[PDB]
Design a protein around this ligand. Structure first.
Ligand SMILES: *[C@@H]1O[C@H](CO)[C@@H](O[C@@H]2O[C@H](CO)[C@@H](O[C@@H]3O[C@H](CO[C@H]4O[C@H](CO)[C@@H](O)[C@H](O)[C@@H]4O)[C@@H](O)[C@H](O[C@H]4O[C@H](CO)[C@@H](O)[C@H](O)[C@@H]4O[C@H]4O[C@H](CO)[C@@H](O)[C@H](O)[C@@H]4O[C@H]4O[C@H](CO)[C@@H](O)[C@H](O)[C@@H]4O)[C@@H]3O)[C@H](O)[C@H]2NC(C)=O)[C@H](O)[C@H]1NC(C)=O
Ligand SMILES: *[C@@H]1O[C@H](CO)[C@@H](O[C@@H]2O[C@H](CO)[C@@H](O[C@@H]3O[C@H](CO[C@H]4O[C@H](CO)[C@@H](O)[C@H](O)[C@@H]4O)[C@@H](O)[C@H](O[C@H]4O[C@H](CO)[C@@H](O)[C@H](O)[C@@H]4O[C@H]4O[C@H](CO)[C@@H](O)[C@H](O)[C@@H]4O[C@H]4O[C@H](CO)[C@@H](O)[C@H](O)[C@@H]4O)[C@@H]3O)[C@H](O)[C@H]2NC(C)=O)[C@H](O)[C@H]1NC(C)=O
Ligand SMILES: *[C@@H]1O[C@H](CO)[C@@H](O[C@@H]2O[C@H](CO)[C@@H](O[C@@H]3O[C@H](CO[C@H]4O[C@H](CO)[C@@H](O)[C@H](O)[C@@H]4O)[C@@H](O)[C@H](O[C@H]4O[C@H](CO)[C@@H](O)[C@H](O)[C@@H]4O[C@H]4O[C@H](CO)[C@@H](O)[C@H](O)[C@@H]4O[C@H]4O[C@H](CO)[C@@H](O)[C@H](O)[C@@H]4O)[C@@H]3O)[C@H](O)[C@H]2NC(C)=O)[C@H](O)[C@H]1NC(C)=O
Ligand SMILES: *[C@@H]1O[C@H](CO)[C@@H](O[C@@H]2O[C@H](CO)[C@@H](O[C@@H]3O[C@H](CO[C@H]4O[C@H](CO)[C@@H](O)[C@H](O)[C@@H]4O)[C@@H](O)[C@H](O[C@H]4O[C@H](CO)[C@@H](O)[C@H](O)[C@@H]4O[C@H]4O[C@H](CO)[C@@H](O)[C@H](O)[C@@H]4O[C@H]4O[C@H](CO)[C@@H](O)[C@H](O)[C@@H]4O)[C@@H]3O)[C@H](O)[C@H]2NC(C)=O)[C@H](O)[C@H]1NC(C)=O
Ligand SMILES: *[C@@H]1O[C@H](CO)[C@@H](O[C@@H]2O[C@H](CO)[C@@H](O)[C@H](O)[C@H]2NC(C)=O)[C@H](O)[C@H]1NC(C)=O
Ligand SMILES: *[C@@H]1O[C@H](CO)[C@@H](O[C@@H]2O[C@H](CO)[C@@H](O)[C@H](O)[C@H]2NC(C)=O)[C@H](O)[C@H]1NC(C)=O
Ligand SMILES: CC(=O)N[C@H]1[C@H]([C@H](O)[C@H](O)CO)OC(C(=O)O)=C[C@@H]1N
Ligand SMILES: CC(=O)N[C@H]1[C@H]([C@H](O)[C@H](O)CO)OC(C(=O)O)=C[C@@H]1N
Ligand SMILES: CC(=O)N[C@H]1[C@H]([C@H](O)[C@H](O)CO)OC(C(=O)O)=C[C@@H]1N
Ligand SMILES: CC(=O)N[C@H]1[C@H]([C@H](O)[C@H](O)CO)OC(C(=O)O)=C[C@@H]1N
Ligand SMILES: *[C@@H]1O[C@H](CO)[C@@H](O)[C@H](O)[C@H]1NC(C)=O
Ligand SMILES: [Ca+2]
Ligand SMILES: [Ca+2]
Ligand SMILES: [Ca+2]
Ligand SMILES: [Ca+2]
Ligand SMILES: [Ca+2]
Lengths: 388, 388, 388, 388
């Protein structure tokens, strides 16, 4: 109809309720489920769907051998009905590639897929299910993007890309697209020293992105975008409640403008909702591996370098595998506020479970409740032994 | 369009004709059919669909081992086209959880799923395929609901929940929802001493629910709701034709306001159509197990404590497995009256058939005819030996 | 929109072109294809679909054992996209039963399914996907119907039923339905001595049905219905070109008002287009079994007792299995005339191919061309050996 | 809505970006994917889909044995969602046959399938999913057509057919259809000596077709059609950059009006975009087999007999199998020009990979970019060993 505008603020997050779970690995032990990784969720005005990067093979298929690898010519961004598994028969290919983002602007959807060899990748921006724009690698070193939904305001949908080293300074760019065309792009500015895989959400005409500093930071870089002025800033979550993985133990004081040190060249896509006292941080429980997942209410985390948790909710037990996590919201729901939501990627197989030769995942996702709901843990649920 | 109003009375029930049957277990012996239990049927203005609680695995899948269990993080309310089986590829997830209800109000559908550990469950009410409201457990003991469709009148859709013991007094509540929001809730009142899994239908602006007294009653508790005044009453079916299972042999006089004794802490979801002389009771044939199923016309069963059958129809032979049963009607059909319908859950596997390690079911459903039709029996039809 | 009216005459049939073929048995050797029999084709204003009676199991499934049987509680009328196979995932159940008919009246579709034990069957007439009317067996001996599409004119859709013996006089009735309700029914009249499985088509406000005399006739009975006056007549195709199976060798003179003798208590559903010189008869090539299939132009077959072929077209080689055949037309196509079409059921398995324990079929269908097209033969195509 | 008119010229082709890839053979190793060959892509105003000629069996199915053969009664033109594989459950049959073409005219789609024995084939032209016209073989020797999309202008959709020898002069005809009816047909004229499998596209009210001279030419014949005057011309691509396969090594001067000699009675469907300096030729890398694939910018190839490459892009490595290739464009995209696209058929199995008994393929397709994008190679990706 008309382009959606971020006119609402976030609903008060007093807890998280179960939103969607596909049990993909369990079901896929005996049905035609595609092998995936890098999933996310994204809504259209009339439906919300699960998204991910297929490996172009089923889990039980012999081609599942080797799917620990990240970039091949057999991957594609696919979407499928909420809480169903990604099957060969119900998955819709949005575009071909090994890194992606997607978002609906209120009128139609924009999907971006990057493909190519490491030194010659290119992104192709689809709008209304047609290719409209292409961008060639500018640093010749794995052009890559969000791996979760972008956000739009009045037709403008900003997207964060990075090209260059994963263990040194790289060239991050913020592109402002409208109808799949480039209106403008900026180089990254601010104090964030390295940016990868931004998780974004919007409220009151502002887009907040919690990304990852693969190079040096265990605290997360944050990019705030003004989609009207098409400008942005960057910093790190000041809080001592560190949210990357692997990471060192929590200090009593964090860092606002520098990566918090202790772990180099590694990390996991993550997210946060930064809204004053209504601030919630997600993170793996383990400081060493992609194990467990919890939400922690850390009032003023973004700006308070001594902020610590005041409430929390366990999502995945530390004795269960987690993975990537990101933000999304149904901007077309009823009500006066936007209900914060997120998904957690539950990785199964390699490298942690090497008795099988594949790597895949299932999805669990939650949204906020103004109620103080009881908690449950939500594991993948599959028995690897069955796949042997 | 406009909210549906229960303006019609029931059609005269002179017999039952076959409405739907999915043969899920038979077909699933060699195709991707999800393992389920707790099924029901529910109509939208333009389509009627089968519903159930998936176990997040196929019947042939190795994860089918253990599906006798009731509540896990891998269950979800799913719906699928009438008389098709619940397959991985055609099932639509309505919400995540292990106890549910759902109903269309004429404009859109409301679906409710409860999930959680036994002492910390919560219900989340979806409306128009979006989460709108959440309710936390109030008794910290398996918050649970209908397991069949709710009914709406002018936007108001009452739902019966129970939280607390299954073998002693519990806290039953009647919530009146409108557009997924809570308008009001009452504690249970009347003479029903224990309420679980209500089967409801509506006619002439009144909603009748035939539930189950798990604690002490072999006769069924009945809740009648006025969706305008948003008030209700409760009693038991007075008839000596006892309809729970297990149950003692039929007496010559029943009980109107107390559970009829003889069997404690057990029962099965069931239903009835209470409409004066046009009253029909469904029940298992066996007084000991979920075996067989028959419909008995028992004029004035609700209020006459000596009422006995005047006509009947066998649905499932006593040499075949049955299970849960419930009511639903197509409130959007043509004609001057609402045609009473019901489904019977045909449980296969554990605990009765333990040579297999799973528990699932298929669905058979009937609706009334003003004709006096010949009867057939409708068994699940699968041979367990094939699954060995 | 508006009820369709049979305002056109038939197009000139100079040959037959390929319309649809699903290769169900071939494909089903390694995919989830339902076991069926008694198929047909039927059009809606916007789509034409394949129809059949499922056996409630896949061909490869273990429950396929025993599917030679005709009536069980696991059968249902299903429809699926033209030329696709009937799979568990794409088949839509129209109704439950073991004998059926279906037709669109221009506004919506009416589907009829009969179910029950031999002495207590009943038909339930669905209209707009809802049950509207029920008819109880009147002769208590396998109430049965067309097994191919019915035809409508201005809302009136006549259907031919038979109840009673298959080897002696029975009670055949012609019901005239409108919106699923019974407007009127007549007993069979005319000279046809036994009627079963009528294949009908309509043109210029007249409905012609070529049925089968299971009891005594090797020539086919024909019922002509006036859907406005709601009256009909009956006779036999006068032609010496005999079209039932099994049958005796063709004589030089046929019979107009009595079954042509030689074979008792057996036959196969078949059809014809009776339109003066534009008359075409379908039949198996074999006079002994359901083997082969050919179309023969026999000018004035209905009324000329010495009519012999003037042109012909082989559809299935005598070294290939055939089965039932029936008529249908796309009454909603463009143009000035109705294009005659038909389907042939290609039966595989029992009883002819007993190395397998199942019985199923695939569908081949043709429509007429005003051109004189070259012919090909169209066999099922599956290798039974593969199923062993 | 209204018939589409070719009002735009081609966009400048500076490189090719990835458009679609289904990874059919990989995925089909463990899912219900139909065996195919002769694929193409074609757009409707609201969606673009993959097309191909099914073999009426899955790859893993036992009936896959023998699918190297070209024409059987079990083939059909099917279409399925872009970048999905052709599965038994998502494939839509357009028509029955072993040679086809299809195109949308802006209002609805026309699909043509030819079937029959070698000496008695016939084409049936479907429009709006209904059969409208039939054409009988005129040379009684494998009537055959494009094997890729046709193109329409103001309702007129020309199609090129050939009937007669594949190794000597044959009878090629250009039919001009409108709403599935024949407006006119011409015999081939011009200097092309043999025509088979034309790949066409349209721009500025002109339709260009790059076909194949199976008999003598290693350079490609080109037919240019005026869909208004319903007239055409024919010649060969003058360029020394030879594009058929097998073929002799490139000379320094090509031929404009005669087949370039060196290889007889063989070839592969291919294509080109002939637009002055904006001219790009596709071809296998190998001069001996259907191996590899590259795009070469050869300014003025059509008219310059000494034109050589000025830029290029590798699509498939010479160490990977290719096959047929053809043109298509989304005539309903936004913008001021038509974006050239093409697909390459990636053949797997027989005859090159004879350890398996089947022959199938997957699809890779690209469209042009005005950017100078980095290149990647796009192989089928399946390991034949897995199928053993
Ligand atoms: C039914 O459901 C309800 C609803 O969920 C249940 O009630 C919930 O119970 C939750 C568990 O108790 C509870 O969550 C915790 O909240 C704490 C905050 O509340 C407390 O402090 C505030 C502030 O003073 C008080 O106001 C309040 O009254 C409470 O006293 C959090 O602090 C908890 O998180 C910390 O502990 C967990 C382990 O429990 C860690 O995993 C987590 O990471 C936090 O601790 C680490 O991080 C801090 C900060 O740096 C460190 O200081 C600390 O030492 C830990 O650091 C180590 O561990 C991390 C992670 O591994 C590592 O990185 C680091 O290096 C160190 O090694 C927790 O979030 C809910 O808030 C509560 N909800 C409600 C509404 O009440 C109820 O129990 C259920 N009922 C039943 C019967 O089960
Ligand atoms: C073709 O189709 C038609 C249509 O269906 C067939 O005709 C139908 O035939 C049915 C079977 O006969 C018949 O159903 C029965 O109806 C009885 C009522 O009708 C009779 O009584 C009335 C009232 O006086 C008369 O007017 C009427 O003329 C009849 O005489 C019911 O009473 C029957 O149910 C009871 O029996 C069945 C076993 O048959 C039990 O399963 C059932 O539970 C009922 O009996 C138990 O319950 C009562 C009440 O408490 C007890 O008193 C009794 O002892 C039984 O109790 C034991 O069993 C229960 C259950 O296990 C247990 O809990 C308890 O503790 C005890 O152990 C039955 O419903 C249809 O009405 C009739 N329909 C029509 C339209 O005619 C026709 O036959 C078919 N044709 C062919 C050729 O097959
Ligand atoms: C390319 O394609 C074209 C288009 O299809 C091909 O041309 C077609 O070729 C067809 C085969 O020849 C041909 O079909 C036949 O037509 C005959 C009628 O035409 C002839 O007679 C008329 C009338 O005088 C002439 O005008 C005309 O010029 C012809 O001379 C039919 O009579 C044929 O059917 C009979 O024969 C077949 C076997 O071929 C039987 O299966 C069939 O049942 C018919 O014969 C039985 O029935 C009759 C009637 O009772 C009996 O008299 C006769 O003895 C047979 O009876 C036995 O068999 C039956 C069945 O088993 C059994 O029940 C009974 O008891 C007995 O045992 C046949 O239909 C097309 O018309 C023709 N089409 C066109 C447009 O030309 C062309 O050849 C192809 N090209 C190539 C290169 O292959
Ligand atoms: C990142 O991505 C970019 C973008 O893709 C990469 O840059 C691209 O690199 C491509 C490979 O170099 C390049 O493609 C070539 O372009 C040549 C034309 O450019 C050159 O000449 C022009 C004209 O003078 C100059 O202006 C320009 O500056 C260049 O110097 C083509 O000529 C190339 O094709 C020929 O070579 C390939 C093998 O590389 C053959 O396969 C191909 O068929 C061509 O050669 C055959 O055909 C010609 C013509 O008849 C014969 O003369 C020649 O001998 C060959 O003939 C044999 O082989 C054929 C085929 O087997 C056989 O039939 C015959 O009988 C003979 O046996 C090639 O197309 C892109 O244009 C370039 N793109 C851009 C935008 O720059 C970049 O490298 C990537 N980065 C990294 C780090 O990898
Ligand atoms: C989001 O904001 C823009 C205004 O910035 C709204 O756009 C106006 O919409 C009306 C109706 O379409 C037009 O007549 C105005 O010209 C539009 N645009 C501008 C840029 O001025 C848009 O409608 C808002 N979205 C929604 C859902 O209300
Ligand atoms: C393509 O061209 C034809 C004109 O040749 C356009 O046809 C006219 O369309 C209008 C609106 O439908 C009619 O009133 C004219 O009579 C049409 N036809 C002719 C043949 O004159 C057609 O609209 C054009 N297509 C598009 C998409 O604009
Ligand atoms: C484009 C790409 O390959 N991105 C991969 C990502 C990066 O390799 C990592 O961010 C370092 O750059 O790692 C991970 C990862 O799980 O750590 C997943 C992504 N597939
Ligand atoms: C929420 C829940 O677990 N409900 C279960 C139900 C209850 O356990 C029973 O009603 C007693 O409370 O039992 C049964 C049952 O078949 O007896 C099924 C339900 N899954
Ligand atoms: C209702 C029913 O069972 N009809 C069956 C039909 C009849 O048995 C036959 O017409 C004789 O009555 O036979 C055949 C048959 O193939 O001969 C198929 C039908 N399934
Ligand atoms: C109608 C038909 O069979 N066409 C086939 C085609 C021709 O055989 C070839 O063009 C020579 O005529 O060959 C090839 C081929 O791959 O060479 C594929 C086509 N299936
Ligand atoms: C998987 O691939 C590895 C590496 O190629 C190979 O050694 C291994 O045996 C394969 N495992 C299986 C089950 O194919
Ligand atoms: Ca399978
Ligand atoms: Ca890091
Ligand atoms: Ca009880
Ligand atoms: Ca007979
Ligand atoms: Ca050639």
């Amino acid at each position: 109809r008309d382009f959606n505008n971020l006119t609402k603020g976030l609903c008060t997050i007093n807890s998280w309720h179960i939103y969607g779970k596909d049990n993909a690995v369990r079901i896929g032990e005996d049905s035609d489920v595609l092998v995936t990784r890098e999933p996310y969720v994204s809504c259209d005005p009339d439906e919300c769907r699960f998204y991910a990067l297929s490996q172009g093979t089923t889990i039980r298929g012999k081609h599942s051998n080797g799917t620990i690898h990240d970039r091949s010519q057999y991957r594609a961004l696919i979407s499928w009905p909420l809480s169903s598994p990604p099957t060969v028969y119900n998955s819709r290919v949005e575009c071909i590639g090994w890194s992606s983002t997607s978002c609906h602007d209120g009128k139609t959807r924009m999907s971006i897929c990057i493909s190519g060899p490491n030194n010659n990748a290119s992104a192709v921006i689809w709008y209304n299910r047609r290719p409209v724009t292409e961008i060639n690698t500018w640093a010749r070193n794995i052009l890559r993007t969000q791996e979760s939904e972008c956000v739009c305001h009045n037709g403008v949908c900003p997207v964060v890309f990075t090209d260059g080293s994963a263990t040194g300074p790289a060239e991050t760019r913020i592109y402002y697209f409208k109808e799949g065309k480039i209106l403008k792009w900026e180089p990254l500015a601010g104090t964030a020293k390295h940016i990868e895989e931004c998780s974004c959400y919007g409220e009151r005409a502002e887009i907040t992105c919690t990304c990852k500093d693969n190079w040096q930071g265990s605290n997360r870089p944050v990019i705030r975008i003004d989609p009207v002025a098409m400008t942005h800033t960057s910093q790190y979550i000041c809080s001592p409640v560190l949210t990357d993985n692997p990471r060192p133990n929590d200090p009593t004081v964090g860092k606002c403008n520098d990566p918090y040190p202790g772990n180099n060249n590694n990390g996991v896509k993550g997210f946060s909702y930064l809204d004053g006292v209504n601030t919630w941080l997600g993170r793996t429980i383990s400081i060493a591996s992609r194990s467990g997942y919890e939400m922690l209410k850390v009032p003023n985390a973004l700006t308070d370098d001594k902020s610590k948790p005041t409430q929390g909710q366990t999502i995945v037990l530390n004795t269960d595998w987690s993975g990537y996590s990101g933000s999304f919201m149904d901007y077309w729901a009823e009500g006066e506020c936007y209900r914060a939501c997120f998904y957690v990627e539950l990785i199964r197989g390699r490298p942690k479970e090497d008795k099988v030769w594949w790597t895949s995942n299932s999805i669990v996702s939650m949204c906020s409740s103004t109620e103080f709901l009881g908690q449950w843990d939500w594991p993948d649920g599959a028995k690897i032994e069955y796949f042997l």
